[PDB]
Amino acid sequence: NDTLKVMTHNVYMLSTNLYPNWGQTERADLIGAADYIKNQDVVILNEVFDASASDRLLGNLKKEYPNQTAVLGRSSGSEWDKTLGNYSSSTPEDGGVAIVSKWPIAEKIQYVFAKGCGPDNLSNKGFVYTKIKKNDRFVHVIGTHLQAEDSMCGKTSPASVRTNQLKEIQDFIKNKNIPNNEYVLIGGDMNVNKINAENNNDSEYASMFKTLNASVPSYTGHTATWDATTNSIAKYNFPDSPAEYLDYIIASKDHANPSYIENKVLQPKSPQWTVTSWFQKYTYNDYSDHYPVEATISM
Ligand SMILES: [Mg+2]
Numbered sequence: 076n077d078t079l080k081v082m083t084h085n086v087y088m089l090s091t092n093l094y095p096n097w098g099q100t101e102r103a104d105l106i107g108a109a110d111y112i113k114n115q116d117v118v119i120l121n122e123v124f125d126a127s128a129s130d131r132l133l134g135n136l137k138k139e140y141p142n143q144t145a146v147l148g149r150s151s152g153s154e155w156d157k158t159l160g161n162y163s164s165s166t167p168e169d170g171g172v173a174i175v176s177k178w179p180i181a182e183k184i185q186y187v188f189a190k191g192c193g194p195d196n197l198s199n200k201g202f203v204y205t206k207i208k209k210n211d212r213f214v215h216v217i218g219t220h221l222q223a224e225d226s227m228c229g230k231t232s233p234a235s236v237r238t239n240q241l242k243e244i245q246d247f248i249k250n251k252n253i254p255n256n257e258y259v260l261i262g263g264d265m266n267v268n269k270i271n272a273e274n275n276n277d278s279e280y281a282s283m284f285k286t287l288n289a290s291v292p293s294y295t296g297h298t299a300t301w302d303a304t305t306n307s308i309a310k311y312n313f314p315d316s317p318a319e320y321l322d323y324i325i326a327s328k329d330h331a332n333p334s335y336i337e338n339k340v341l342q343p344k345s346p347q348w349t350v351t352s353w354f355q356k357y358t359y360n361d362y363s364d365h366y367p368v369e370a371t372i373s374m
Pocket residue numbers: 087122
């Protein structure tokens with residue numbers, strides 16, 4: 076059909092040794108059985124940090140998406156064709172990024188970013204590069220999750236670390252020498268806020284595209300990807316935060332140009348699940364604190 080369906084979802088699967096009461100094991104089952112995550116070609120996952128919950132989620136997704144990477148930064152073995160950048164076996168947490176596909180994966184590279192900030196500096200953040208074979212066409216998908224806005228960053232502003240990380244992605248793409256007739260897609264939680272910024276040419280939002288040499292997609296669906304006013308987990312953690320637009324799937328302008336590319340923010344609600352936290356009982360109807368972004372690429 077000349078249509079690629081790529082989805083990205085930050086799934087809030089924090090390690091159960093630090094954040095034990097967040098329904099990780101249960102949400103792995105709910106997500107695996109959910110409707111919204113069906114019918115895609117490729118799904119990018121962020122925040123699959125918890126060992127068990129993530130194996131279980133990746134295991135539930137095996138039926139529709141049997142071609143899978145390992146989780147970024149969890150190992151450096153032969154599950155990866157190559158491991159690049161500042162990878163370290165001693166930093167406590169992995170990078171939380173995995174890519175799953177219905178189509179065979181010809182090549183799997185992990186890259187760990189050089190610079191980090193605050194708690195992210197204990198992480199192994201980066202990107203996962205995949206080259207995917209979809210009917211005699213090769214498409215390239217980079218899945219990432221950039222430095223978060225953190226108070227504990229210090230004199231290092233988080234925006235400046237993100238600019239660095241984006242340059243790392245772009246240099247990897249430039250020196251990968253990918254034919255300009257193939258599609259190069261970059262997806263994930265970029266931690267760069269579209270809201271109130273889509274009309275300033277010097278915003279961090281406008282710079283992201285310039286730094287990646289990437290085109291601006293068309294936007295449909297909900298107006299925020301992280302939204303304390305509609306989402307039960309984000310309301311619990313940050314009841315008075317304004318809504319943020321942080322998650323993206325975008326195409327490199329130096330390679331194949333789509334006839335169109337759409338980013339649609341979905342708002343699916345899960346079955347009720349409940350947790351006990353600080354002696355009180357809480358019930359949620361969300362899969363995660365982020366909403367998923369479904370991208371449609373017309374090739
Ligand atoms: Mg988060």
